[PDB]
Amino acid sequence: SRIGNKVVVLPAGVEIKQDGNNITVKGPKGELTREFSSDIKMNIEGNEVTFIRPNDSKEMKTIHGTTRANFNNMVVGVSEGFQKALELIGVGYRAQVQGNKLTLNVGYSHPVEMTAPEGVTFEVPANTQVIVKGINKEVVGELAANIRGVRPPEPYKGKGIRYVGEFVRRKEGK
Amino acid sequence: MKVRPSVKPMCEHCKVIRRKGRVMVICPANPKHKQRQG
Amino acid sequence: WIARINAAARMNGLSYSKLMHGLKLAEIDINRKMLADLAVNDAAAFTALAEQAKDALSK
Amino acid sequence: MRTTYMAKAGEVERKWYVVDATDVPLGRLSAVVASVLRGKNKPTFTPHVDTGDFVIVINADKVKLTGKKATDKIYYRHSMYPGGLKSVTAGELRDKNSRRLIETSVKGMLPKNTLGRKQFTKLNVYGGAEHPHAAQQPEVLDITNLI
Amino acid sequence: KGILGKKVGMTQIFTESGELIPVTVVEATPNVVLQVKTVETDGYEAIQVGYQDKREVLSNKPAKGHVAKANTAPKRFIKEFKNVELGEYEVGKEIKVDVFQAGDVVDVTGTTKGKGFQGAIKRHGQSRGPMSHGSRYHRRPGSMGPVAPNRVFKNKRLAGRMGGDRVTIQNLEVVKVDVERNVILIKGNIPGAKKSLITIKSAVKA
RNA sequence: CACCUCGAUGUCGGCUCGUCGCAUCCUGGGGCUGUAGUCGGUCCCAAGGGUUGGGCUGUUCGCCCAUUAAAGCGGCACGCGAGCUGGGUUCAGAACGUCGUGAGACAGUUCGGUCCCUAUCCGUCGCGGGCGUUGGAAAUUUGAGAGGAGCUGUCCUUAGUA
RNA sequence: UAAACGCUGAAAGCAUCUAAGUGUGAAGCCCACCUCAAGAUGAGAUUUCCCAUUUCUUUAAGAAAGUAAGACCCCUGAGAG
Ligand SMILES: [K+]
Ligand SMILES: [K+]
Ligand SMILES: [K+]
Ligand SMILES: [K+]
Ligand SMILES: [K+]
Ligand SMILES: [K+]
Ligand SMILES: [K+]
Ligand SMILES: [K+]
Ligand SMILES: [K+]
Ligand SMILES: [Mg+2]
Ligand SMILES: [Mg+2]
Ligand SMILES: [Mg+2]
Ligand SMILES: [Mg+2]
Ligand SMILES: [Mg+2]
Ligand SMILES: [Mg+2]
Ligand SMILES: [Mg+2]
Ligand SMILES: [Mg+2]
Ligand SMILES: [Mg+2]
Ligand SMILES: [Mg+2]
Ligand SMILES: [Mg+2]
Ligand SMILES: [Zn+2]
């Protein structure tokens, strides 16, 4: 029952490069790098990676778990990437993507224009469905949150942008 | 957000946590249970 | 005198408190006026006194 | 007998030291530097005359602020106009003007008199590792053991 | 963009559509770039500009030497312009009113007319005291402050010399430019007495 | 309570001038809502600016009229009388009710009634002289630091849309 | 940056705005706009001008005495007072 002790595998052909800090991961989706802590020691197998903490102090446990999760997310992003799926709901709400530019008409007097960073892209399979797809989970989450915040859900009628499947309490406004 | 000196869980879903040195009660069920110590 | 003796003792690898403790152990009764005079003028003699103090402290 | 030595202005030779502030707590750096500037490190110390040495502080931008001082230690100053209180955090001063940070810390420790102000003028602080006072042939002053 | 001129005076002009607007006539005999300052030599970028040719007997050998580089007669007024493109300017270059066009929005700087020693009522627009009902308090500057400080706070405004200050009016409109007469007509009124120095610059706010 | 002041520390209100605190009246940001919307309620952050003209009364206060985005609460000797006023309160006159046998007095009212001072020092607002800034001069300048400014309505359109 | 809201994230397999990491966010803070400002004795910077004289003392950062560049006295005045 410990993320820090739980091992990390390397499916497909993901590669990892070590360095005093700034551990790097490479694979089909792309590359990633994070300045991992110098205290948690990483052991590498042909396909399995493990993290060990020097002791059992509060700080070592905390940093151990965080680093293991961070490395795991780096590998999983490089392998499969990440995606946030947003489902905008409204009478005339719609979305459309031109390249790395996303235009949202969500009831405001003006459209809302959003720009993806180089590591992220917008799919927009439909006019009411958006998908932020990237490699870095943090970047994907931040972009998805910004899109959602452009017009967050409201309780009475459900209008607004929602993460696909997120629960939305609805009040029975009179 | 109820800002008060006494922050306690109001229902079984309320969870007491600490953010930036302040005691906070965050409840996924009822937003009215959102409390901060202050 | 104490400040000057402190400076000289530090240059000799010793704090004023340690120096005076060592001198008392070594039975040296030279007072602070004379010690400050040696520190400013006769650095060699002051070093000899400091060495005796360090020897006494070691013992 | 009244034979105690009293230094004369101009007879004592003031040296030049270089102090690297990298990761040294601000206060401890200031304390050792203040003693040197006053001349407390030399036997010829005479309270009513200046006998300390010049100090060149380098890497001021890397001085260390333990705890939450970086954002919570506040330097105030009043313009003497009503409501003319200005404040700036120690962290902001370190990032933008670290020379002032070191100088203010050292000013607080030197005496508040004519001799103290003159002794302060012998202080030179430079964020970064290089200074223009090579002509004075300053020598390094390790302080790892002094702090 | 900037220029130095002399506040000739005020008149009014009929625009198209028949509207009537007040204009200030500012004459600017071609200014000359006397020096170019750079980060290399001075640490900041700007151009020194001279205006209003001066009689030689009114100039000094050091002043003549300074203007010799630009190869022009001594100038009465000299000022530095910042936020300009140094590449476009060189010592000896001339600046004419044609640098501006009608409809430009500019900031005009001048030195306010001096009123001399003035009381608080005029100088700071403070309220008089009652003129009757037994009042012996008409044009005085009010209370100096509360008791507790045992002093007077700074900025307790009082009588003193009024005017003669550097004042900038922002967003004035260049109504017209006459290159033949080196005249700029600026909508409105600008600080300074007639024949005083005036500095026109492209509005910073714009 | 009686610690400074009785070889005097001037008392209410108003005027002039403000300045500060935030427990915020408006404007700004936000959480919750028994928040559909327009309005709100409550709480959190926020003191940058602004926060009125009259009738009555000596008044503060308060009621009223008419506005405003708002008409905040307080400290500063209930700020500010060597800056002003002096209507009220505490002198001498006179009168009413009342008490007293009385002179008189208030458990109360009413009419009338001297507000002195040439700024020495600090402080504040302006303006010069001297010297310094390390050869002597003429100009132009960077900006350590400081001050100023900081408010807000209504209408139109988006849209009679959500 | 405040309140507030996060993203990722363990301690605590979950959850979690935080511990590390990372973001949005106010008429408020630092700028931005205006003015003063190197007596900022830390007295800054740039351009230009004058030129190394004379006499006596003493090696003196000596003294004085003519000046140079320049400034002022004095005088006519105002856009200044
Ligand atoms: K008394
Ligand atoms: K609210
Ligand atoms: K405020
Ligand atoms: K009235
Ligand atoms: K007040
Ligand atoms: K009076
Ligand atoms: K008084
Ligand atoms: K005094
Ligand atoms: K100067
Ligand atoms: Mg309770
Ligand atoms: Mg009035
Ligand atoms: Mg005082
Ligand atoms: Mg008693
Ligand atoms: Mg007395
Ligand atoms: Mg508050
Ligand atoms: Mg009072
Ligand atoms: Mg008074
Ligand atoms: Mg009777
Ligand atoms: Mg009574
Ligand atoms: Mg009468
Ligand atoms: Zn709950």
Nearest-angstrom CA–CA distance, E128 and D66: 58
Breaks (C-N over 2.5 A) in chain A follow: none
CA angle B25, B27, B29 (to 5 degrees): 165
* Contact predicate C19/C56, CB 8 Å: no
Q: What is the crossing angle of helices C43-58 and C16-26, to 10°?
A: 70
**Dihedral angle of Cα D7, D12, D16, D17, to the nearest 10 degrees:** -50
Nearest-angstrom CA–CA distance, C51 and C9: 10
Chain G nucleotides covered by protein, CB below 7 Å: 3-23, 30, 32-36, 42, 45-50, 69-71, 79-81
Residue A32 CB neighbour total at 10 angstroms: 23
Instruction: Give whole-number Cα distances, E114 to E25, E58, E78, E141, E200, in Å.
Output: 21, 25, 22, 21, 21
Nearest-angstrom CA–CA distance, A106 and A115: 17
* Contact predicate E49/E4, CB 8 Å: yes
- SS3 string, chain E, reads CEEEEEEEEEEEEECHHHCEEEEEEEECCCEEEEEEECCCCCCCCEEEEEEEECCHHHCCHHHHHHHHCCCCCCEEEEEEECCCCHHHCCCCCEECHHHCCCCCEEEEEEECCCCEEECHHHHHCCCCCCCCCCCCCCCCCCCCCCCCCCCCCCCCCCCEEECCCEEEEEEEEEEEEECCCCEEEEECCCCCCCCCEEEEEECCCC
Instruction: Give whole-number Cα distances, E113 to A85, E172, E198, in Å.
Output: 68, 19, 13
CA angle E144, E145, E146 (to 5 degrees): 145
Nearest-angstrom CA–CA distance, A3 and A7: 8
Nearest-angstrom CA–CA distance, E71 and E94: 11
- Scan residues 1-38 of chain B and list those with Cβ within 7 Å of strand F: 1-3, 30-32, 34, 38
Six-digit token pair at D99?
């020379």
Nearest-angstrom CA–CA distance, A18 and A25: 9
Which residues, other chains included, contact D90 with Cβ-Cβ below 8 Å and sequence gap of 6+?
D26, D65, D69, D70, D73, D74, D75, D101
- E117 CA, F129 C1': separation in Å? 20
The residues pairing with B22 across neighbouring beta strands, listed in sequence order, are B19
Given the DSSP bridges, would you call strands A31-34 and A23-26 parallel, antiparallel or unpaired? antiparallel
* Contact predicate D14/D122, CB 8 Å: yes
Nearest-angstrom CA–CA distance, D63 and D85: 26
Q: E89-125 burial by CB neighbour count: b if 16+ within 10 A, else e?
A: bebebebebebbeeebebbbbbbeeeeeeeebbebee
Given the DSSP bridges, would you call strands D123-126 and A129-134 parallel, antiparallel or unpaired? unpaired
CA angle A6, A9, A12 (to 5 degrees): 165
| 3-state SS class at D127 | coil
Q: Which of residues 125-184 of E touch D (CB under 8 A)?
A: 153-155
DSSP string, chain A: --TTTS-EE--TT-EEE--SS-EEEE-SS-EEEE---SSSEEEE-SSEEEEE-SS--HHHHHHHHHHHHHHHHHHHHHHH-EEEEEEEESSS-EEEEETTEEEEESSSSS-EEEE--TTEEE--SSSSEEEEEES-HHHHHHHHHHHHHTS---TTT--EEEETT---------
Residue A83 burial (10 A CB sphere; 0-12, 13-18, 19+): middle
| 3-state SS class at D70 | helix
Size of interface D-E (CB pairs under 8 A): 7
Instruction: Specify whether the backbone of A68 is left (phi greater than 0), alpha (psi in -120 to 50) or beta.
Output: alpha
- Chain D residues with at least one Cβ partner in E under 8 Å: 80-82
Helices H, strands E: what count in chain D? Answer: 5, 6
| 3-state SS class at D76 | strand
Residue C30 sits at the chain D interface (C-beta within 8 Å): no
CA angle E92, E98, E101 (to 5 degrees): 145
Q: What is the crossing angle of helices C32-40 and C2-11, to 10°?
A: 50
Six-digit token pair at C26?
């070594």
The residues pairing with E103 across neighbouring beta strands, listed in sequence order, are none
| 3-state SS class at B4 | strand
Which residues, other chains included, contact D74 with Cβ-Cβ below 8 Å and sequence gap of 6+?
D87, D88, D89, D90
Which residues, other chains included, contact D13 with Cβ-Cβ below 8 Å and sequence gap of 6+?
none
Nearest-angstrom CA–CA distance, B33 and A5: 36
**Dihedral angle of Cα D95, D96, D99, D104, to the nearest 10 degrees:** -80
* Helical residues (DSSP H) of D54-127, grouped into ranges: 69-72, 90-96, 98-109, 114-121
Q: Do you know the residue count of chain C?
A: 59
- Scan residues 10-69 of chain E and list those with Cβ within 7 Å of strand G: 35, 37, 41-43, 60-66, 68-69
* Nearest Cα to Cα of residue E110 among E184, E195, E51, E29: E195
Nearest-angstrom CA–CA distance, E131 and E107: 42
| 3-state SS class at D64 | strand
Six-digit token pair at E129?
């005291």
Six-digit token pair at C21?
């403790």
In a 13 Å sphere around the CA of E71, the CA atoms on its Cβ side amount to 5
Nearest-angstrom CA–CA distance, E78 and E83: 17
* Nearest Cα to Cα of residue D20 among D147, D128, D123: D128
Nearest-angstrom CA–CA distance, E190 and E169: 7
Residue C5: closest C-alpha in chain D: D43
Largest CA distance in chain D: 58
Task: Evaluate if the CB of E160 falls below 7 Å from strand G.
Answer: no
| 3-state SS class at B35 | strand
Given the DSSP bridges, would you call strands A94-98 and A101-105 parallel, antiparallel or unpaired? antiparallel
Which residues, other chains included, contact A98 with Cβ-Cβ below 8 Å and sequence gap of 6+?
none
Sign of the CA dihedral with E189 first, then E195, E197, and E203 last: positive
| 3-state SS class at B38 | coil
Instruction: Give whole-number Cα distances, C18 to A33, C50, E6, in Å.
Output: 54, 10, 81
Residue C33 sits at the chain D interface (C-beta within 8 Å): yes
Nearest-angstrom CA–CA distance, D60 and D19: 10
Sign of the CA dihedral with D117 first, then D120, D126, and D132 last: positive
Nearest-angstrom CA–CA distance, C1 and D43: 9
* Contact predicate C53/C23, CB 8 Å: yes
Residue E168 CB neighbour total at 10 angstroms: 14
* Nearest Cα to Cα of residue A139 among A86, A99, A96, A81: A81
> In angstroms, what is the resolution?
3.0
CA angle E48, E51, E52 (to 5 degrees): 160
Task: Evaluate if the CB of E167 falls below 7 Å from strand F.
Answer: no
Amino acid at site A158: G
* Contact predicate D109/D126, CB 8 Å: no
| 3-state SS class at D85 | strand
The residues pairing with A160 across neighbouring beta strands, listed in sequence order, are A89
* Contact predicate A24/A34, CB 8 Å: no
Amino acid at site A141: G
**C-alpha A96 chain-centroid distance:** 21
Nearest-angstrom CA–CA distance, B10 and A115: 42
Nearest-angstrom CA–CA distance, C31 and C50: 14
Site of tokens 């069920």: B29
* Contact predicate E111/E202, CB 8 Å: no
* A48-52: strand order across its sheet: A8-9, A48-52, A41-44
Instruction: Give whole-number Cα distances, D141 to C2, D53, D57, in Å.
Output: 24, 11, 10
Six-digit token pair at B13?
């879903």
Site of tokens 């006019």: A127
Six-digit token pair at A157?
């009628």
